[PDB]
A paper describes a structure:
In the course of this process, Prp43 acts at the latest stage of the splicing cycle and it is required to dismantle the intron-lariat spliceosome into the excised lariat and the U2•U5•U6 snRNPs. Prp43 action is also essential for ribosome biogenesis. For these crystallization approaches, an N-terminally truncated version of Prp43 from C. thermophilum was used (ctPrp43ΔN), which lacks the first 60 amino acids.
Numbering used by the authors: 61 to 758
The structure:
RNA sequence: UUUUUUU
């Protein structure tokens, strides 16, 4: 129960957790572990952990927080052996997997037994699991079926500074839960926190600060600002490989296509360096969220050897988003290149629209990016901006996601978690009252909430799916339209990135191949055609990787959609949601699917402004939009339903489907009662249709 | 005319 007693157990020739002998690797790792900064203050942690329920833990990047603290807790529970687990949340999936593997080696156990991890589509845990690393979202999902979270004796919220939606909800639940359960220890960790703020939020909780740093990270700034950060990044990477001593490179960029372009350009230049300038080999790895876990994990591959002894060193270059910004320890990395940008989510309360925008990062993020080096060996960080641009122009801390998001989903889960009063629900940063009210009214229109704001059985059922309420309600109500199987597939396809591939090289052949899946009356149906063909060739036994290539479809996203569909189907079967289909050659086969979409998306409908106008007008809001250029429908109806809203240098609605206005009055009579509609051509048009429908009464 | 993340 004290530090020196626990250390004696760690030195034992036999492993307490397996009943088998400790390997020789274990003892060398253990020797290196005890040189970490957090190890110096282990006792100071222990007596604070004992005397307090909630604790804030701060230490530099490299300190030992994520890997050592849960082990400290585990060894503290050692003398009496509980069934309850120790939880450690990570904001990223790659983080949860990588750290769990590391700790598994540190405890000399195999991954998935004593030390495991849990993320979406992968629950690598067992009945022997004592320590579980997971994503904050995964834990939040677990809490929606276990409010008290009885499975856990200790929950460690890591990298809390990121302030994701899950993190904020979790902090609020855990704070209120800590009054209910005194047998629940809670620890909040980060290298870049606002300590006093977090302390004050958790009932003036104690703070433990570890001062030390394992290895130094030298930080360099540009003398003047550069306008093309992608060009400056590529230039920096190539300069390092050409002149600097050995050491792998971590480069941060903003998005997938930017990264894929960068990797191509880096590889091209390196290849010419290698052939004509005696440069060493360089492997380039892309890293972003939509990559499968197997390809993400390839960043831990060893850098290539030099071509010849005494030759220029071979090295590795990881080109990543900010999923590699925190938590990860990539051994071999010496150089970090920080252009200072990330794609961030912004929200407009007025226009109901959320969008992505490439923006400057915060000082905390910048510090974190640099912290990916200086972990195993001294590091260098090349910040592609000015030192005074760092101190004056960069925000101290990125704004919380809950202040930058649509809260329709967030609110629905809060009700499911059993939050009695939304107004007095103590969130660390409370969102704007209008954002909150508008979420309540959307959930009200979807019949997920009462008029008094209490959960509907429908709403309770909607919170079971990894989907936004509108998408969930569409899926749940689909059997009423006799096409639940098809909506299930469409729902899955809407939950993944665009399956369509259109390289600059052959855009016109890509559109040629897309044209054979094209359905005149909507993009949703076009997706369904592409999916059926995909599954058709799959069952036929053809290899899909090539099949997707000749058809210009993303095998990556199509495969990802199948994972979603399998998960969603299992949920539907669990809660007795009927799975049915209409025979393909039936006349109403397509119309049923189109009408089914409206069951959840009746609030995302736009009318054509005039006779020969390409401008559409959203209902109620009356926003002026254009149909996204990547649309299948050649000649669109005066009434369409759209799935998403996008903002390029023009305002677009995306993935639209031609509908008939009489469907709107049929499926959503409350939202489309015309007393609510006010002084509009949309109300005029809708009024005429209602009268026509009444006439058809005869 | 790309999905930054996460369920
Ligand atoms: N996968 C790994 N390979 C080699 N060393 C590692 C690995 N993970 C962690 N370490 C060592 O343990 C230290 C602590 O890592 P970690 O607990 O993740 O730090 P923190 O959570 O404070 O950032 C690292 O700085 C590094 O020295
Ligand atoms: C806008 As900047 C990250 O170059 O200071
Ligand atoms: F602060 Be550690 F790098 F997660
Ligand atoms: Mg960490």
């Amino acid at each position: 129960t004290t530090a020196k007693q626990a250390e004696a157990v760690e030195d034992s020739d036999i492993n307490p957790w397996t009943g088998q002998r400790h390997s020789e690797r274990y003892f060398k790792i253990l020797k290196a572990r005890r040189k970490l900064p957090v190890n110096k203050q282990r006792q100071e942690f222990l007596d604070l952990y004992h005397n307090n329920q909630i604790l804030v833990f701060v230490g530099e990047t490299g300190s030992g927080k994520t890997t050592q603290i849960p082990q400290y807790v585990l060894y503290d529970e050692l003398p009496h052996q509980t069934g309850k687990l120790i939880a450690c949340t990570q904001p990223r999936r790659v983080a949860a997997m990588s750290v769990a593997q590391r700790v598994a080696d540190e405890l000399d156990v195999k991954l998935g037994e004593e030390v495991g991890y849990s993320i979406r589509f992968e629950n690598k845990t067992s009945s022997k699991t004592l320590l579980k690393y997971m994503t904050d979202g995964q834990l939040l999902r677990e809490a929606m079926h276990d409010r008290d979270m009885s499975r856990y004796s200790c929950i460690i919220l890591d990298e809390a500074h990121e302030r994701t939606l899950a993190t904020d909800i979790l902090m609020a639940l855990l704070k209120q839960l800590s009054e209910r359960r005194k047998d629940l220890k809670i620890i909040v960790m980060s290298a870049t926190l606002d300590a006093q703020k977090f302390q004050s939020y958790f009932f003036n909780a104690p703070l433990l600060a570890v001062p030390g740093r394992t290895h130094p990270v030298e930080i360099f700034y540009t003398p003047e600002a550069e306008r093309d950060y992608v060009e400056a990044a590529i230039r920096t990477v190539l300069q390092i490989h050409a002149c600097e001593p050995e050491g792998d490179i971590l480069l941060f960029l903003t998005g997938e296509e930017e990264i894929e372009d960068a990797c191509r350009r880096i590889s091209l230049e390196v290849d010419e360096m290698i052939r004509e300038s005696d440069a060493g080999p360089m492997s380039v790895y892309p890293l972003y969220g939509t990559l499968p876990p197997h390809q993400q994990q390839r960043i831990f591959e060893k850098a290539p050897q030099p071509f010849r002894p005494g030759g220029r060193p071979g090295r590795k270059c990881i080109v990543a988003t900010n999923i590699a910004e925190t938590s990860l320890t990539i051994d071999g990395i010496v150089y970090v290149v920080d252009p200072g940008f990330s794609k961030q989510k912004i929200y407009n309360p007025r226009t109901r629209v959320e969008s992505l925008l490439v923006s400057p990062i915060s000082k905390a993020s910048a510090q974190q990016r640099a912290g990916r080096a200086g972990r195993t060996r001294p590091g260098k960080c090349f910040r592609l901006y000015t030192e005074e641009a760092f101190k004056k122009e960069l925000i101290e801390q990125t704004y919380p996601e809950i202040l930058r998001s649509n809260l329709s989903n967030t609110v629905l889960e809060l009700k499911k978690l059993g939050v009695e009063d939304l107004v007095h629900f103590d969130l660390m940063d409370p969102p704007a009252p209008e954002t909150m009210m508008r979420a309540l009214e959307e959930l009200n229109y979807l019949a997920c909430l009462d008029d008094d704001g209490e959960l509907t059985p429908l709403g309770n059922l909607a919170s079971e799916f990894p989907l936004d309420p509108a998408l969930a309600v569409m899926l749940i109500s689909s059997p009423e339209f006799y096409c639940s199987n098809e909506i299930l597939s469409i729902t899955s396809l809407l939950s993944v990135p665009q399956i369509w591939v259109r390289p600059a090289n052959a855009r016109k052949r890509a559109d040629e191949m897309k044209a054979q899946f094209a359905h005149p009356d909507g993009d949703h149906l076009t997706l369904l055609n592409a999916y059926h063909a995909y599954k058709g060739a799959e069952a036929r036994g053809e290899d899909m990787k090539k099949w997707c290539h000749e058809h210009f479809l993303s095998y990556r996203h199509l495969s990802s959609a199948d994972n979603v569909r399998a998960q969603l189907k299992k949920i539907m079967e669990t809660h007795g949601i009927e799975l049915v289909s209409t025979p393909f050659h039936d006349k109403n086969y397509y119309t049923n699917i189109r009408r089914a979409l409206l069951a959840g998306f009746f609030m995302q409908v736009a009318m054509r402004e005039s006779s020969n106008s390409k401008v559409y007008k959203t209902v109620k809001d009356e926003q002026l939009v254009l149909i996204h250029p990547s649309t299948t429908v050649t000649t669109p109806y005066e009434w369409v339903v759209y799935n998403e809203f996008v903002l390029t240098t023009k305002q677009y609605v995306r993935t639209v489907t031609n509908i008939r206005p009489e469907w709107l009055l049929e499926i959503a009579p409350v939202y489309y009662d015309l007393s609510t509609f006010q002084k509009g051509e949309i109300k005029n048009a809708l009024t005429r249709v209602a009268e026509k429908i009444r006439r058809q009464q005869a």
